Amino acid sequence: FLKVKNWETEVVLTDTLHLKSTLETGCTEYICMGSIMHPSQHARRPEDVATKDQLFPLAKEFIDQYYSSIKRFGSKAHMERLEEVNKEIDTTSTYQLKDTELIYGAKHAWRNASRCVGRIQWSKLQVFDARDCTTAHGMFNYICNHVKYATNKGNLRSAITIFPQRTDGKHDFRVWNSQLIRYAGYKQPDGSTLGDPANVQFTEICIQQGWKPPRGRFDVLPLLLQANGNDPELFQIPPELVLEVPIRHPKFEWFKDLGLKWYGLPAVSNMLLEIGGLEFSACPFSGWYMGTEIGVRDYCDNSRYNILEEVAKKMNLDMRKTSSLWKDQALVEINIAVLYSFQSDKVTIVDHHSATESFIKHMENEYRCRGGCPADWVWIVPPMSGSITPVFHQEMLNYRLTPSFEYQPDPWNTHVWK
Amino acid sequence: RFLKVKNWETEVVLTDTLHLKSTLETGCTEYICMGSIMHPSDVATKDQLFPLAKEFIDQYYSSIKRFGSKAHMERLEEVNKEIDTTSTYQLKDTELIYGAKHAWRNASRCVGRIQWSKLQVFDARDCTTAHGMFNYICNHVKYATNKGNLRSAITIFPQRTDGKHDFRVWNSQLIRYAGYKQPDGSTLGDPANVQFTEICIQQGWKPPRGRFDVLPLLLQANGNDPELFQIPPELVLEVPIRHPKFEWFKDLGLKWYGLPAVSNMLLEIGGLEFSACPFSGWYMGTEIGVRDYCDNSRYNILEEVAKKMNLDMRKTSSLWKDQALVEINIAVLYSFQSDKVTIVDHHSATESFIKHMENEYRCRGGCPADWVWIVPPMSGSITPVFHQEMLNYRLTPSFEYQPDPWNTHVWKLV
Ligand code: HEM
Ligand code: HEM
Ligand SMILES: Cc1cc(N)nc(COc2cc(CCN(C)C)cc(F)c2F)c1
Ligand SMILES: Cc1cc(N)nc(COc2cc(CCN(C)C)cc(F)c2F)c1
Ligand SMILES: C[C@H](O)[C@H](O)[C@H]1CNc2nc(N)[nH]c(=O)c2N1
Ligand SMILES: C[C@H](O)[C@H](O)[C@H]1CNc2nc(N)[nH]c(=O)c2N1
Ligand SMILES: [Zn+2]
């Protein structure tokens, strides 16, 4: 057992759930890597098709956990299912998840996402089974429906769409986009950058793939879909499905004249979903934004939109030195605008005070019913106003549970074309 | 066997070989990370003290490029002679200064480490009484405060012997305001220090029962009962907090002290334990302005400032707390600069610390850092340490925590 204390309320939780931890965190008792982006390459099976003694033990574990979840350990259906995975693996070197197993594993991957502040909602995920897809066109149909359903005219709903699992590796389904909706980034001739600088390499892949770019600041990027390992394919998301919020300020009338907007749907599309030894290399999932993701990081990182110096000018701020806190002060007004805009257009959005409060409650709930909750303090603490949110003063144990979401290399580094 | 760290903003990559040296446990395991735990997990005999001593002397003579030398080998023999016959040994003045400087340098949670080498070390190992401790500490303060041009300093008192004759400063910092719990449940002054205020009052302190009463020193020498001493007012530099734009801000009546002086930590060198070792530098703005003034368990002036800003304090998505918080830290920096009291803001400090980190990688092979503590408690993302990965390990000499003296001391009067 390992206790965790809240240094603001003195609540102490007692974690036993960590004992079911399978993968290495990256830490040793002599060195802590809690601030490394990807601390560990400890996967669960070799990079392409594993052998029977490699795959079944992972499969046996998940099926065990799922039947144990529904209070049917060792039942008729449980024992039959193991034997069924046994024969599938025998004759296909893989196995196929039942519909309910798919939904259980997808929801529980979200649940063990040690980095997601927005997990109090985990069991309310909508799972779209796309395991029957065969082409990039079909991938585009599935994604498009995802976006309509999730967006819900602004009343956002969490959803994941799950494309066929990895087989041998040279037949992967991928979304080459990192998120379903991102603006483009163009390397200007004078060395500067128009649009979103994180997406310059991807914006150039799209150009070199055929995309006519409008060469602006908020060009929604094309989807770039790969099916069954083949060459990826450009599709344009119908604009009427890309709900966008223009950013204005509840006080500074001049703010709208900055011509800033952002998209209302955050949909991570480049990660890998891992259930019982199976690897779903294409599993786009979406929810709704915490304000700070847009207004702190997207707008105010140096390597991102860097609107800070611009907004500070209009604020008439002494930018001669740092000790004036002109960056701090504009950062707040920006994140004030971003919130007030989304709420004004009735687009779902949550502020960092409301969401962190929820996660404290979610930790309670979890510790009380599950015996723990994995939590990555470095990522949970919002990137502005850290200590005036509850999460800051909350001790967090971090450990890796399966099912889970895993990083994976960008498909263009590992894809020989045709 | 190297370990790399990346800055996801600049994309600089640093190679850490220093982590091999460490031998003290972080608290993590291979399957759980304890990087957000505030505190993870009588005194040492002869046999534990030999290697620790050897370790330290070895690393010291290496730093002065004299490893293997006659002076190195004779020192070791001398150190063993002492432990062999008194179960302890005594650091040289050179080693004491080296050790103290490196304990700071090795403080993975300190962002201000770029100045580690400029420490002024005051040896107080000859002290024997609480009055002696008060004298030494008063000199510390006058020196460190330096009429506002603050200077880093440490004062090191006699080492632990049997855990029964221990010097301690009961004070957690050398200058802290007092806090009193009122009948009605309201709290006057600093609520952090309420329990310590009660300990003092009980021991004879006659409190002014105001909002900013400098507490007294509660000084323990040689394991005896501690003793009360009032720092001379003329040595406590204080800053009245005003705001460059908001005229009304002075009326809040806030002030803060100028000298941050940590006193309840243990300094560990060569297996020796220095249980009283107050140290001091200057302040980063956020330590007063975010945590001292705006934590809920503390002075909690957020409510009061936002009223005097006419902010909408109903819903949270108005970000009134964020907005007031910036202003309070604008005020705490402006106030110090005007009175020409040394202070660094969180932008400048993080900036410097990245430079420090990079230099420490070059010359030394790494630098242990605790991203949880290095990232400031406001505007984290727009400081460069946010985008900087950091390896964390425990190098000795180090500053450790120790239990609060009032939990473990056994009294003697009447
Ligand atoms: C519904 C509202 C949600 C909110 C407000 C939210 C918020 C966040 C935030 C702030 C992060 C930190 C990373 C960053 O700042 O970019 C994060 C990480 C993450 N979230 Fe959520 N999220 C939500 C829903 C979801 C859903 C629906 C899923 C999957 C079904 C998910 C899975 C993840 C994963 C995998 C990570 C990162 C883990 C890693 O990098 O190892 N989140 N989330
Ligand atoms: C000179 C200017 C200095 C600045 C601006 C500075 C700043 C900081 C800050 C912000 C922290 C985080 C702790 C908190 O916020 O509560 C810290 C921690 C720390 N400082 Fe420094 N500091 C300075 C000098 C020193 C000196 C002179 C020493 C000792 C010789 C020292 C030893 C430490 C230690 C040991 C910690 C870590 C506490 C722990 O591990 O729990 N610092 N410092
Ligand atoms: C569903 C959802 C909702 C929401 N409101 N926010 C998010 C943020 O999702 C992620 C963001 C990053 C950025 C990491 N950086 C290296 C680019 C990495 C991940 F693994 C994520 F899952 C997701
Ligand atoms: C010399 C110096 C300068 C400076 N500007 N700041 C500091 C802050 O050092 C510490 C602060 C805390 C606060 C931890 N909280 C529970 C109250 C605990 C420690 F052990 C520290 F060493 C020191
Ligand atoms: C170096 C550091 O680990 C890195 O910048 C992390 C810090 N914490 C984060 N927290 C969130 N929510 N998102 C991030 O991308 C990061 N980046
Ligand atoms: C629970 C968590 O570890 C705790 O609130 C820490 C986080 N980081 C911190 N960082 C600093 N500088 N000071 C602190 O007191 C803390 N508190
Ligand atoms: Zn760790």
Three-state SS letters, B67-122 = CCCHHHHHHHHHHHHHHHHHCCCCCCHHHHHHHHHHHHHCCCCCCCHHHHHHCEEE
> Rg for chain B (alpha carbons), in Å?
23
Pocket of ligand 6 (CB under 6 A): A 7, 392-395; B 36, 38, 372-373
Resolution (A): 2.3
Which residue numbers come right before each break in chain B (C to N over 2.5 Å)?
Answer: 41
B357 touches chain A (CB under 8 A): no
In a 3-state reduction of DSSP, which class is residue B261? strand
For B:154-213, CB contacts with A below 8 A are none
Residue A200 corresponds to which tokens in the numbers above?
């310059």
- Phi and psi at residue A149, in whole multiples of 5°? -60, -50
In a 3-state reduction of DSSP, which class is residue A122? helix
Residues of A with Cβ-Cβ distance to B326 under 8 angstroms: 325, 328-329, 332
- d(C-alpha A86, C-alpha A53), whole Å: 11
Catalytic residue (choose from A44, A81, A111, A119): A119
Q: CA–CA distance from A35 to each of A248, A379, B73, B112, B168 (Å)?
A: 35, 9, 41, 19, 35
For A:313-352, CB contacts with B below 8 A are 322-325, 327-329, 331-333, 335-336, 339-340, 343, 351
Residue A380 CA to ligand 5 centre (angstroms): 9
Nearest to B32 among A21, A354, A383 (CB): A21
Known active-site residue A116: yes
Name the residue among A26, A378, A393 with its Cα closest to residue B374: A378
B143 lines ligand 2 (CB under 6 A): no
Burial letters A232-267, b for 16+ CB under 10 A, else e: bbbbebeeebebebebbbbebeebeebebbbbbbbb
Say whether the peptide bond before residue A403 is cis (omega within 30 degrees of 0): yes
The residues of B assigned a catalytic role are 110, 113, 282, 287
Cβ neighbourhood burial of B261 (10 Å; 0-12, 13-18, 19+): buried
Q: CA–CA distance from B73 to each of A120, B70, B77, B102 (Å)?
A: 62, 5, 6, 22
Closest ligand 1 atom to Cα of A160: 30
Catalytic residue (choose from A111, A116, A274, A366): A116
In the sheet with B272-274, reading across from the earlier edge strand, the strands are B272-274, B266-269, B398-400
**Cβ contact B346:B284 at 8 Å:** yes
Residue A309 CA to ligand 6 centre (angstroms): 30
Domain boundaries, chain A: 15-131+158-168+272-286+356-380, 132-157+172-243+407-411, 244-266+289-354
B93 touches chain A (CB under 8 A): no
CA-nearest residue for atom 11, ligand 6, is B373
- d(C-alpha B146, C-alpha B237), whole Å: 9
Instruction: Identify the nearest ligand to the CA of A388 by its number.
Output: 6
Number of Cβ within 10 Å of residue B19's Cβ equals 21
Nearest to A30 among B22, B351, B372 (CB): B22
- d(C-alpha A336, C-alpha B319), whole Å: 6
How determined?
X-ray
In a 3-state reduction of DSSP, which class is residue A121? helix
**Cβ contact A271:A411 at 8 Å:** no
- d(C-alpha B54, C-alpha B270), whole Å: 8
Kindly give, in sequence order, each residue whose CB lies less than 8 Å from that of residue B2, ignoring residues fewer than 6 positions away.
B15, B16, B17
- d(C-alpha A111, C-alpha A366), whole Å: 10
Q: How far is A5 from chain B (nearest CA, A)?
A: 8
- d(C-alpha A79, C-alpha A58), whole Å: 16
- d(C-alpha A43, C-alpha B248), whole Å: 59
- d(C-alpha B256, C-alpha B237), whole Å: 9
Question: Counting every residue, how long is chain B?
Answer: 414
Nearest to A388 among B19, B318, B321 (CB): B321
Name the residue among B283, B280, B281, B278 with its Cα closest to residue B136: B278
Question: HEC states along B281-311?
Answer: CCEEHHHHHHHHHHCCCCCCCHHHHHHCCCC
A405 lines ligand 1 (CB under 6 A): yes
Q: How far is B158 from chain A (nearest CA, A)?
A: 30
- d(C-alpha A295, C-alpha B208), whole Å: 47
Number of Cβ within 10 Å of residue B314's Cβ equals 8
Question: In this complex, do B30 and A34 lie within 8 Å of one another by their Cβ atoms?
Answer: no
A289 is in an annotated binding site: yes
Q: What angle do CA A121, A122, A123 make, to 5 degrees?
A: 100
Residues of B with Cβ-Cβ distance to A384 under 8 angstroms: 322, 378-381
- d(C-alpha B314, C-alpha A227), whole Å: 50
Question: In this complex, do A388 and B22 lie within 8 Å of one another by their Cβ atoms?
Answer: no
**Cβ contact B411:B37 at 8 Å:** no
As a dihedral over the C-alpha atoms of residue A72, residue A76, residue A82, residue A83, rounded to 10 degrees, the angle is: 180
In a 3-state reduction of DSSP, which class is residue B4? strand
- d(C-alpha A158, C-alpha B234), whole Å: 62
Taking CA atoms, what residue in A is nearest to B329? Answer: A325
Which residue numbers come right before each break in chain A (C to N over 2.5 Å)?
Answer: none
Known active-site residue A288: yes
In a 3-state reduction of DSSP, which class is residue A224? strand
In a 3-state reduction of DSSP, which class is residue A41? coil
| Best residue in B22, B300, B382 for a mutation probing chain A (most A CBs within 10 Å) | B382
Tell me, what amino acid is at B87?
S
Q: How many CB pairs under 8 A join A and B?
A: 217
Name the residue among A324, A301, A302 with its Cα closest to residue A312: A324
Q: Which residue, chain included where needed, has tokens 């087989």?
A: A167
Closest ligand 4 atom to Cα of B38: 16
Q: Of B109, B196, B262, which is best to mutate to test ligand 4, by the most ligand atoms within 8 angstroms of its C-beta? A: B262
Residue A37 corresponds to which tokens in the numbers above?
């982006």
Nearest to A29 among B29, B325, B329 (CB): B29
- d(C-alpha B17, C-alpha B391), whole Å: 11
A293 is in an annotated binding site: yes
Name the residue among B29, B111, B24 with its Cα closest to residue B351: B111
A79 lines ligand 5 (CB under 6 A): no
**Cβ contact B329:B378 at 8 Å:** yes
Nearest to B379 among A18, A302, A331 (CB): A331
